[PDB]
């Protein structure tokens, strides 16, 4: 078999290529996206953050959401590094919220399991929520931090 094999992968997709965390919109506005980072880089990098995602209505931003006035070009930024765990950074004009708690802009916060970021606060009808899903696979490798396989 050859061509048929390619079809088999169509139904059975291999999830977890090198994903760090997943972003899911609970308010139903933006399509689910998956944040990823290279393990080799994370293992080699001892200082600073390995990789950070920028979210906003800008097509540049690592994450693209609905073009909302309450949101900024780069509404928020997510960073993964340090001795494990993940960090959430806000970069919006109108502010970024975490589970109803407004965090300090351009500030790093300790990620939470299935956490959620709210944005567009100020107008009851202009708030958007986002949920972050962290895969245990990434943490599993970080715990071992040992290389013994190709790709």
């Amino acid at each position: 078999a050859t061509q048929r094999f390619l079809i088999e992968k169509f139904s059975q997709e291999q999830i977890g290529e090198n994903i760090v965390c997943r972003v899911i919109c609970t308010t139903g506005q933006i399509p689910i996206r998956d944040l990823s980072a290279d393990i080799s880089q994370v293992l080699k990098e001892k200082r600073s953050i390995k990789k950070v995602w920028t979210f906003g209505r800008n097509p540049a931003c690592d994450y693209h959401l609905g073009n909302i006035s309450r949101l900024s070009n780069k509404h928020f930024q997510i960073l993964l590094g340090e001795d494990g765990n993940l960090l959430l950074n806000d970069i919006s004009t109108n502010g970024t919220w975490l589970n109803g708690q407004k965090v300090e802009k351009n500030s790093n916060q300790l990620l939470s399991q299935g956490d959620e970021i709210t944005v567009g606060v100020g107008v009851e009808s202009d708030i958007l929520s986002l949920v972050i899903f962290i895969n245990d696979k990434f943490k599993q490798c970080l715990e071992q931090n040992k290389v013994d396989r190709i790709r």
Binding site: R57, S69, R70, S72, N73, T93, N94, G122, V123, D126
Partner: peptide, 10 residues
């Protein structure tokens, strides 16, 4: 072809 940032109207 232009952004738009604000902080609610009041």
């Amino acid at each position: 072809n232009d952004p738009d940032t604000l902080e609610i109207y009041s």
